Design a protein around this ligand. Structure first.
Ligand code: F43
Ligand code: TP7
Ligand code: COM
Ligand code: COM
Ligand code: MG
Ligand code: MG
Ligand code: MG
Ligand code: MG
Ligand code: MG
Lengths: 548, 442, 246, 548, 110
């Protein structure tokens, strides 16, 4: 069998992937590209309509002296120019973030206690179902108590709703099934039993507020909007006074005491509230991605679907816009989910571990790290040396470092079943890479990688942390591309090899096992391709309230 | 002394202790017992060894519902607490026989830790207490069981939570009265970001001791904020004395006179009567069947009004044995007194204003919660400069069991560990005695 | 005590409502049982639910303040805290929102009173709330046409009256009998239907309403003409301003 | 002549506005309303399509037992139901916030020094124009240096551009006028001369990043996005090394040293980064509103256009969604800009002041406050007493308190020429209102108003501040509806009466005197009406990249 | 003098106050010292520099003994100088808020 990346390379270039020579400068610059051409014409129309110059191919240096490559979206047969994978140009990657930003998990366990102990009323599946009917009217922005209320247009907010889940099957089956995330239907039996044991008799809401509101406002809006309409529905469904002392317990419960944010707030230099990308820990991101419950027989596929989720969110949207902006970081990210390159390196490492130790059977120590991480690193770098077309494809050193190290780190975690030794292998890969080719990444690429080895196993205040708990706000990780999404993969890798149903939080895992989401979290890379082809229909548009 | 004022000091049973003490003997800047309380709060940490052990056994670390399968560690921490605590103390202390203190509680389940004062003499703020305590206990646990390099990061997670990915110690198994400096609404607010429930827990629900500790913390914060500087210093000292320290037995007496049958309105009548008799207010003008009162000393009127406010809280919420109405008392005591006298209410309207939002945000959908979760750093209740929150402490102290978010729900670890420190549990005794001991040095 | 400045009937009425010595005029008789049905928290005959044990079974700590403040009966028992809430029309209802809150905390013990423009509420221990609620319904605090008992959907204080002179009510909890001139309450305060309506009596006539009201209005007694009341409010504003500065 | 609100009252109700009695309960509930009917049918379709119940008129209490009123957008003849003024349903209100959020002002004064002193190059109007041509290519997301860059689609980012302004008329004439905000053309002559004296020889950029990016990300993205494309345009146009030490001075200049954010970051309880509504001080909001440069002959109109700008932004979007959500606070806000009610009260107060004192000639003391604020308060309250229809229109007390106090406070500031005494009059109005009707606003309406009088003139740390500098993060003001937008109007009022060209920051005033904005900041209320009629065309839609 | 308070390029027309602060620096500094100190022979230090254009202020150690952190230094210094300036020139209640803004800026909105 070939390498998984060969077909991609044969489509990009007319030469064989092994040839060291090509010809440049004859391709027409931007005119070689159907997308650049569309951009040139659009820029002329825009400038004429608004009276200010804009896109102009003659500013600065002339693009396209080399081949402007199409990219294969890995695991698909879709080939697109890279501009179609820019988050601005791809409605699927915008909606994936919106679906995370607009989600919060809110318990009903404290609320039900207030009802029984403080108000002295009964809670049954019938009153729960009535509450859920009420809150699904109210949550998109409609009234239940006051006279002369004005309301949101239901069709503008059709994507907002509330569902529940519980580990108790018999309670789950008595609630109206329209409102229930069925753990037994969404997860394979072994995973469902693990998840149901974690949740037990608790009952949890998954709240999704409207995309149009999330885009007008911010991520920290979500838990507040959620709490307001939970509160109104509790007033209505359980016949409180419309504003008595007990009402306040429900607000505190919904806003603080049993709320699970997707991201925690950030310090002042990068000031942001809850539910922004920098607050989402790597373990949550892996659990948001739903590849684990459909692809559980292939831990490589599960781990790399997480890489793709994270590389997009963390490098393209978060680091490439929230934290910088402009043309951004599309290809720093696409390197990890195009052309089946990372897949080839990581399948090689999984097979090496399978044959030598067996998944999860290697000793969890430095000896395993030095073995697996070195072998996979040398495999990856040799592919760039044997195939000049591959090196021209992933032309930036940063790109290559992230892909090789991801394979080494994931592979090491496959062997030990522990994400922390996987992380040690990531950094070792970087050190070997640097010495082999006398280069690594961009000017500031290996800040965290040089600090890396010593902080994998540190226990000091702002150094020590299991990888699953780390995230974009871990100090060493806060600034640079080509790491965060790959770390999410390394977090997933040992748990996919062990067959674990979740990486860090079982409620987060369950909360995204939902067919009413706009973005399909079971097939992240297929969704990126669909968005690239302009075939994705996002929520939150305003066509209905604007002129033809 | 800068002020001519003197006050008679009483104990929590209404007994005289010392007569005619200079006002500044009660000042946070001068009273050594307040200094002891403030430094004790800065340096005292509670460690939950049972919780650390359970988190490691289940790999449940990093926040609510979080778990890392495959990372479980079975260690017998409670069963080896004496040896762990001793190793931790050697790391925490600066020298042998300094003021370091490490005591085990509940058979090794908890640990009271008081970090040496010397560490705060070369510190900018107060986080050295949790951070030094956390790393000493992490290292001591690792050394006690020879935890491997590969596993030790789970012990760190079990102690300090998701920090530093989170800004807070999210999921931590240590606790302090203070919260992290980033959460301050403004510079100088740290002593105000102590939850009312924590104050009630540390004082074991004794109404006058909870009022005193709360007033000490609030008014000491007003010095750090610069609010009690220059023209305002006397107002804040008089508020501390009369509202929080039962100066001249005024609070105690008002409650005695009104406790069997009284209402908020009847406490107001008695207070106005006493203020007139003591010469604090005088009749300034007569309208039709209505006397307009005036005063030559607004700071003293404020202090008298603030003592009645305390008493009214004690009487109204004590009768209901239910804390929730404190927001109503804080509002309508001040609203009623203004139209009873023609004089301004406590803190020149700011208690009334604080009470308006505090009522709304303790009886509505929009936020807040029950009375015990508020504090002087809360956006809802930060506006009055020390004159509202001590009444909330007193009211929660009197609550018989009407709150879902009670001190037992939010502050159990504080109750069990911080109540052990004498100056935290009975601050009124120590502040008054220290004031007598310095009365002739002021 | 003097309670409030001013020389209008309005000002005097505001004073009377606050004055615990002033005997509220009883205008109607309501049975204890019908009070419970209006409140809607429990059924008559049902035992009072508890949120905590009786105080005698708790053994609470030595505390001179506790010893000195006698609890109300419901607190001794461990009763729930429940509520009654009223809406008062701006067309000369006798009581009005701030008048209520001010008066409750002069008249009643253990009270949590809240004031809003369209609702005014009191929360206290259940059995004590029932005694208070009877006086709030039987006396001049209440007119069955210009006042309403409403735990939710309170709209009306600012609306025009209907052709019978009744205040608007989303949920039509109080019904005027055109053929008899009496108001019946047909639902409890949260809007649930009652088994048997409660007679609330006849609406007060507009002449009597004007004589008893506590709202200032240009077509009654205007606030601007009660200069002694205005003067005191302006004084409080001035003294608050100066106090805040120096 | 009739009061200005009479026409609106006659169109709402069959009765004449003075009548005390009407009939209820026979209008058919929601069926009386065209908009509610649209919502009912949309809710059925949404429920059927997604398989989860949604909007349902039979949940909760039955809306429409009284007349569901239309509202006149003040200064227009447009009548709309209140749901058409909800920010979710009104693309003009969303675009107003986006146009503020995506804007930052960035100096070129430090940047040009670095060029001349550190690099030893020359800066001329010719190099500036070349830089501006480069940055208008780069700013929307297009490349100038590197090979194989992928770029944003120019048509999706057509609303992003960079203009400059300066007080130096000679430099301004040398620069291509497409890039120039011409102070002399946009402002009357007296205002232009004041503004030019403030800016002097400084040269400032107005940067607007794309709406689609602002909606995907947050306000703290704006200054970062701006700085990266300024940096690339400086590299390109002035021939630096593409990444040398001096490149860092430009980044520090554009990100920190000469940047003017529209809002400053917020503390943790309400954690938000820069350029969110809570950080925008009242003085800035008044200066963003452009009524002052078109309606300068009518200081009431200028002031009340500012009230409308702030009431919408601060109450409906900021407090009603960012800090709460759900059905929200439409009518708390519309009370301030519908039915010409506030206009009537405030025109009366302006006539009172002008006749007794003359504008800005009253003594700036408490005597003037007690006079003007009392008289205007009694006038406003009396209108509700004489016109039962008006009282049923503005049915919530909070609404009435905000409108009456705004008239009183603005009028007091018209008299004194000072906003701090205007503020004192706002609070006195509240106290008089509360005693007249024995009610004021909602449960927590007058927290700031009871704190109010003592904090007008305080000088203590977190108490004392001139009103122009206060904003939604001023402690007493941080929580409640019915104040913030009205305070922005009081901030504008004395400056309108004096004829001042700006309230607090001349750079902000100039930066929104720009005809290439999407929202027309010269006619805020007219734009709200256009959005209510579904005739406003926003930026940032994704129709171009989605299926048909 | 310019009413330029509250941040870069900010100005409030009509609020200008013309006070000779530098020319009376010695008296203002003395008044402020009396407010900043705790006792008359503590380690409070207030020294004028550049002929009254600048002041070196060292808040007494005792204030930090009973403080949680370090913000007492700017906050106590700012209010003492605000009050000292108001008292020196008898600045009115109506104008004093501008002295506050000149000393401590846009805080607490920022
Ligand atoms: C449940 C509360 C307590 C609370 O925390 N918020 C509520 C309800 C809440 C809900 C009502 C939505 C629904 O009906 O389902 C919303 C829309 C906030 C949200 N969650 O989106 C709201 N109020 Ni309220 N609320 C308002 C108001 C009011 C006025 C209404 C009095 C009258 O006579 O009608 C009173 C307060 C007072 O009396 O001053 C009021 C109360 C109340 N307000 C009482 C319910 C009153 C009742 O049972 O009818 N608001 C107003 O005064 C006008 C603006 C209106 C806001 C909606 C808009 O701005 O368009 C709405 C703002
Ligand atoms: C008080 C505080 O809520 P919490 O007590 O922290 O839950 C705060 N909310 C608000 O201020 C609600 C403001 C908008 C709704 C009320 C408008 S009157 C906030 O969410 O940060
Ligand atoms: O050249 S640098 O390493 O500074 C930036 C790479 S995008
Ligand atoms: O009724 S409340 O004042 O609590 C809220 C009004 S929206
Ligand atoms: Mg080999
Ligand atoms: Mg699908
Ligand atoms: Mg005695
Ligand atoms: Mg009877
Ligand atoms: Mg246009």
């Amino acid at each position: 069998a070939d390498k998984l990346f060969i077909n991609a390379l044969k489509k990009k270039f007319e030469e064989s992937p092994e040839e060291k020579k090509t010809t440049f400068y004859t391709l027409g610059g931007w005119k070689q590209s159907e997308r650049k051409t569309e951009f040139v014409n659009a820029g002329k129309e825009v400038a004429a309509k608004r009276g200010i110059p804009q896109y102009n191919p003659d500013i600065g240096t002339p693009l396209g002296q080399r081949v402007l490559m199409p990219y294969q979206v890995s695991t698909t047969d879709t080939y697109v120019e890279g501009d179609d994978l820019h988050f601005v140009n791809n409605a699927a990657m915008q909606q994936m973030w919106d679906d995370i930003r607009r989600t919060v998990i809110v318990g009903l366990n404290h609320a039900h206690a207030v009802i029984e102990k403080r108000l002295g009323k009964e809670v049954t599946p019938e009153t729960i179902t009535h509450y859920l009917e009420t809150v699904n009217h109210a949550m998109p922005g409609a009234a239940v108590v006051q006279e002369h209320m004005v309301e949101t247009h239901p069709a503008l907010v059709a994507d907002s709703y509330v569902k529940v889940f519980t580990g108790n099957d018999e309670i789950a089956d008595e609630i109206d099934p329209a409102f229930v995330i069925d753990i037994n239907k969404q997860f394979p039996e072994d995973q469902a039993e693990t998840l149901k044991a974690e949740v037990g008799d608790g009952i949890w809401q998954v709240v999704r507020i409207p995309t149009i509101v999330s885009r007008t406002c911010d991520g920290a809006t979500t838990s507040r909007w959620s709490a307001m309409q939970i509160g109104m529905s509790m007033i209505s469904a359980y016949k409180q006074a419309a504003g008595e002392a007990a009402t306040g317990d429900f607000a505190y419960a919904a806003k603080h005491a049993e709320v699970i944010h997707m991201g925690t707030y950030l310090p002042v230099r990068r000031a942001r509230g809850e539910n922004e990308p920098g607050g989402v820990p790597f373990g949550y991101l892996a659990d948001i991605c739903q590849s684990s419950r459909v692809n559980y027989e292939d831990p490589v596929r599960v781990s790399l679907d997480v890489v793709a989720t994270g590389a997009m969110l963390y490098d393209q949207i978060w680091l490439g816009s929230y934290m910088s902006g402009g043309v951004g970081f599309t290809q720093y990210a696409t390197a990890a989910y195009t052309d089946n390159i990372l897949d080839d390196f990581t399948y090689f490492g999984k097979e090496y571990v399978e044959d030598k130790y067996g998944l999860c059977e290697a000793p969890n120590n430095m000896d395993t790290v030095l073995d697996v991480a070195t072998e996979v690193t040398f495999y990856g770098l040799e592919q760039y040396e044997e195939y000049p077309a591959l090196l021209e494809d992933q032309f930036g050193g940063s790109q290559r470092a992230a892909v090789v190290a991801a394979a080494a780190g994931c592979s090491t975690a496959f062997a030990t079943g522990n994400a922390q030794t996987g992380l040690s292998g990531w950094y070792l890969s970087m050190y070997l890479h640097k010495e082999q080719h006398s280069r690594l990444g961009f000017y500031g690429y290996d800040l965290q990688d040089q600090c890396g080895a010593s902080n994998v196993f540190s226990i000091r205040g702002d150094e020590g942390l299991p990888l699953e708990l780390r995230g974009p706000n871990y100090p060493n990780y806060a600034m640079n591309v080509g790491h965060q999404g790959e770390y999410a993969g390394i977090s997933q890798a040992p748990h996919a090899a062990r067959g674990d149903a979740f990486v860090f939080n079982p409620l987060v895992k369950i909360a995204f096992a939902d067919d009413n989401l706009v973005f399909d979290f079971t097939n992240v890379r297929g969704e990126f391709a669909k968005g690239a082809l302009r075939e994705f229909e996002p929520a939150g548009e305003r066509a209905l309230i604007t002129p033809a | 002394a800068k002020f001519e004022d003197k006050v008679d000091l009483y104990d929590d049973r209404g007994n005289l202790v010392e007569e005619q003490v200079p006002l500044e003997a009660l000042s946070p800047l001068r009273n050594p017992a307040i200094k002891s309380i403030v430094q004790g709060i800065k340096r005292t940490v509670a460690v939950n060894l049972e919780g650390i052990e359970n988190a490691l056994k289940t790999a449940k670390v990093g926040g609510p519902a979080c778990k890392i399968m495959g990372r479980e560690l079975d260690l017998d921490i409670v069963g080896n607490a004496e040896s762990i605590a001793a190793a931790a103390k050697e790391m925490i202390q600066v020298t042998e026989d300094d003021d370091t203190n490490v005591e085990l509680l509940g058979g090794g389940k908890r640990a009271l830790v008081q970090v040496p004062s010397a560490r705060f003499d070369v510190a900018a703020e107060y986080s050295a207490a949790p951070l030094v305590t956390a790393t000493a206990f992490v290292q001591a646990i690792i050394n006690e069981f020879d935890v491997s390099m590969y596993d030790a990061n789970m012990v760190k997670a079990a102690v300090l939570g998701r920090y530093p990915q989170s800004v807070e110690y999210m999921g931590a198994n240590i606790a302090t009265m203070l919260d992290i400096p980033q959460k301050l609404e403004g510079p100088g607010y740290a002593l105000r970001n102590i939850m009312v429930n924590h104050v009630v827990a540390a004082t074991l629900k004794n109404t006058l001791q909870a009022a005193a500790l709360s007033t000490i913390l609030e008014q000491t914060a007003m010095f750090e904020m610069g609010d009690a500087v220059g023209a305002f210093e006397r107002m804040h000292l008089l508020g501390l004395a009369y509202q929080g320290m039962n100066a001249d037995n005024l609070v105690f007496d008002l409650v005695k006179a009104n406790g069997k049958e009284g209402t908020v309105g009847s406490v107001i009548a008695d207070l106005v009567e006493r203020a007139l008799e003591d010469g604090v207010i005088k009749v300034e003008k007569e309208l039709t069947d209505y006397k307009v009162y005036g005063t030559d000393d607004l700071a003293m009127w404020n202090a008298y009004a603030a003592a009645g406010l305390m008493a009214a809280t004690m009487v109204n919420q004590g009768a209901a044995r239910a804390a929730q109405g404190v927001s109503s008392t804080l509002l309508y005591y001040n609203d009623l007194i203004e139209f009873e006298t023609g004089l301004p209410s406590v803190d020149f309207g700011k208690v009334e204003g604080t009470a308006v939002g505090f009522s709304f945000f303790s009886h509505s959908i929009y936020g807040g919660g029950g009375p015990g979760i508020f504090n002087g750093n809360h956006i809802v209740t930060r506006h009055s400069k020390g004159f509202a929150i001590p009444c909330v402490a007193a009211a929660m102290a009197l609550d018989a069991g009407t709150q879902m978010f009670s001190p037992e729900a939010t502050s159990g670890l504080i109750k069990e560990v911080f109540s052990q420190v004498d100056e935290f549990r009975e601050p009124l005794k120590y502040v008054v005695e220290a004031a007598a001991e310095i009365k002739n040095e002021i | 005590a003097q309670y409030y400045p001013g020389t209008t009937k309005v000002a005097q009425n505001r004073r009377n409502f606050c004055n615990p010595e002033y005997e509220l005029e009883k205008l109607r008789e309501i049975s204890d049982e019908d009070v419970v049905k209006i409140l809607g928290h429990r059924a008559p005959g049902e035992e009072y639910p508890s949120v905590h044990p009786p105080l005698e079974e708790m053994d609470e700590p030595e505390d001179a303040i506790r010893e000195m403040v006698e609890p109300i009966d419901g607190a001794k028992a461990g009763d729930r805290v429940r509520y009654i809430q009223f809406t008062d029309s701006m067309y000369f209802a006798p009581a009005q929102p701030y008048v209520r809150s001010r008066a409750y905390l002069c008249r009643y013990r253990g009270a949590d009173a809240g004031t809003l423009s369209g609702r005014q509420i009191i929360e206290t221990r259940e059995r004590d709330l029932e005694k208070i609620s009877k006086e709030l319904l039987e006396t001049e605090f209440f007119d069955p046409a210009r006042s309403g008992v409403r735990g939710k959907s309170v709209h009306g204080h600012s609306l025009r009256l209907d052709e019978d002179g009744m205040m608007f009510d989303m949920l039509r909890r109080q019904i005027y009998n055109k053929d008899t001139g009496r108001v019946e309450m047909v639902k409890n305060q949260i809007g649930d239907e009652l088994d048997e309506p409660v007679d609330l009596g006849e609406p007060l006539d507009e002449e009597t309403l004007m004589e008893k009201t506590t709202i200032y209005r240009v077509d009654g007694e205007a606030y601007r003409d009660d200069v002694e009341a205005v003067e005191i409010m302006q004084r409080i504003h001035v003294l608050r301003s100066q106090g805040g500065f120096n």
